[PDB]
Ligand SMILES: NC(=O)CN(CC(=O)O)CC(=O)O
């Protein structure tokens with residue numbers, strides 16, 4: 436399949452060079468996979484989600500995305516126009532409030548929730564969890580992300596936006612999950628992207644068009660926007676049978692575009708998420 440005039444990030448994950456405009460992907464599109472977006476929520480009524488989105492859990496007085504961040508991230512995963520995996524099932528877990536904050540205790544409870552809840556859902560191609568959140572180093576936060584991954588979910592987490600080594604942030608610094616840095620449409624490391632040996636992979640993270648609350652759309656930037664590209668890619672590859680939850684981060688790094696990014700520090704991987712799709 437081909438999406439003409441796609442958001443640059445989508446075009447970028449289907450090309451070996453920057454600057455293209457069509458997103459080419461296999462039509463299976465993540466069908467039969469499931470991606471838990473653990474964030475401020477998902478506006479599942481947005482027409483872009485085509486009924487494929489639902490809230491399954493909130494830790495606040497409402498399950499509504501009053502912020503927009505989780506709806507944006509969910510749209511990069513699996514919206515019809517802005518998503519990598521256009522036929523994936525999306526589940527919202529609201530661990531962040533409408534200002535975008537959440538206590539680590541809440542975030543950890545959300546991760547243990549998903550490890551259990553996936554057992555009450557039909558996800559025959561497998562389960563991914565996208566975590567565009569984090570704060571300072573926490574061994575308990577890292578532990579929770581490791582359990583989620585060990586339970587059989589492909590965990591993708593934001594490297595963070597501190598232009599610093601991700602070793603000092605969580606869940607970015609948990610080695611067993613997939614830690615995602617951000618790039619821009621000229622193949623530079625994004626100005627704010629964290630870096631470090633613990634990064635697994637980069638995805639598109641500067642100026643990313645996606646869904647927004649109130650049935651709308653907007654462009655925003657962050658390792659939060661790169662993470663759902665990687666989460667969607669894993670869903671897509673899992674549906675295609677080319678990888679499993681346990682091995683997907685490795686597979687994506689194995690098959691990445693290599694050495695394309697500029698301003699990558701010594702000791703950080705120069706790998707950009709790539710779907711190797713051949714019409
Ligand atoms: N979402 C991100 O990675 C960074 N951004 C994105 C945004 O929310 O507009 C700022 C923030 O989170 O404060």
Ligand SMILES: [Ca+2]
Pocket residue numbers: 609610611612613614633634635684
């Ligand atoms: Ca890792």
